[PDB]
């Protein structure tokens, strides 16, 4: 943290914040959700980290170079240590990245390093070659060489993501699946695990072994797993939470803008709210049925329920304000809702679903006051607009994510946040082979377009190819886009270091401090 001169720090340097749900795991290779990453960024530090403006900055790697954006050499700082006193070495990153792509690890972020296209990754992920063939090697203890199969100038932006953090070989081989237990875990972040009580709290305490511990201010941070946005807000107002989750309850947000405007932060957020179609669950294997759902959803009615936050209606998957995206709105977005509804009922009727023989689907969503309200709305809209019956199923955050991977759902409330500020961070999730493809979308045409992005001469072509992928995704109605997120949360006036200028919202407890109150 960088405390401004003249600012008086408080006696007690503690922070409470709501994470929004109970985390999948504290194992960096066993997570895929934003809540999981919020804790991982405090516990584990990768090669690069996000600065206050969201730009890649030095982490364990103090400098780095590249040749043709193909061979990346990372120079690791020599005072980089684990929580057991052992130094963080290039070998840790070889082991860690080899583990992440091991079929036996079964990481949901297995395909992440495949977005960087590290040498020999393709055959390793499908279990044809061994993990030791991966194009990452320890040239020495403090020098890591990453060899890629094609040029990727945005490779370095990937390396802020927790699924790219080092993981301690000793602890994992000693404790197995018990390696993240409070007493056992070994961390290289600014914090280590003090306590973990399921559905109550995760307590981290400042790790003195951290190389930059001299600049850490917050001694202890608590993450709460409160799914109810109403309860989060109420506990914040009762003075028990310092920072809410960035999910605001539809009903109270207008009240909160009026009463505590100074404490209400709303900033750009590279995430898309959408209704994810299981493309392999009948009748959603039919593109006509999928298109009927896409058109039959009224975004304007839905967006007007969250108007106070100022969400823009969504016409695609990749946020158009994503760095290197010049997206075009599809013709159907320009139509009236009455015209979308007619065309949707026609397309349904072609597939043999009419008023007389109706379509009944299950809309899955993760426990939430925001998601329940917008689901009831969406359910009602689809019923009046295109005569589709929509029953609501709710599950806890962990089960929700599992259900979508297994493909045991019809349509799920979905929300993707960019891991790095580049359209591939989104678009690569819809690749046939991607471990993050919970849509189960398989288009050789879409895969072909994305493969073409790595054979490009200038960035102007790369941007155009991304727009063609978004168009193909839209033509195949892979998803029902609803609205592009904003980063809206409540932050007590005594919490400093939160600027909200990072559009990925990759904040670190080590960057924050408590002003006297
Ligand atoms: N790039 C990581 C990501 O976007 N992961 C998804 C998971 O598929 C996620 O965490 N997304 C964030 C949206 C869900 C988080 C919150 N609890 C809510 O439901 O509001």
Author numbering: 27 to 543
The publication says:
The Opp ABC transporter comprises the periplasmic binding protein (OppA), two transmembrane domains (TMDs) that span the inner membrane (OppB and OppC) and two cytosolic nucleotide-binding domains (NBDs) that drive ATP hydrolysis (OppD and OppF). Peptide-bound OppA docks to the TMDs, triggering ATP-binding and substrate translocation into the cytosol. We demonstrate that isopeptide-linked tripeptides (Z-XisoK, where Z and X are natural or non-canonical residues) are actively imported into E. coli via the oligopeptide permease (Opp) and processed intracellularly, resulting in high accumulation of Z and XisoK.
The structure shows a good overlap with previous ligand-bound OppA conformations and adopts the closed state, with G-SisoK enclosed in the binding pocket. G-SisoK engages in extensive interactions with OppA through its backbone and termini. Expression of wild-type OppA fully restored sfGFP expression with G-SisoK, whereas the D445A variant, which disrupts the interaction with the N-terminal α-amine of G-SisoK, did not rescue expression. Mutations targeting the hydrogen-bonding network at the C terminus of G-SisoK (for example, R439A), had less pronounced effects, suggesting that the OppA binding site possesses some structural flexibility. The OppA–G-SisoK crystal structure revealed no specific interactions with the serine side chain, which is accommodated in a spacious pocket. This suggests that OppA binding and uptake rely primarily on recognition of the tripeptide backbone and termini rather than side-chain identity. One notable exception is R439, which lies within hydrogen-bonding distance of the C terminus of the ligand and is replaced by glutamine in OppA-iso.
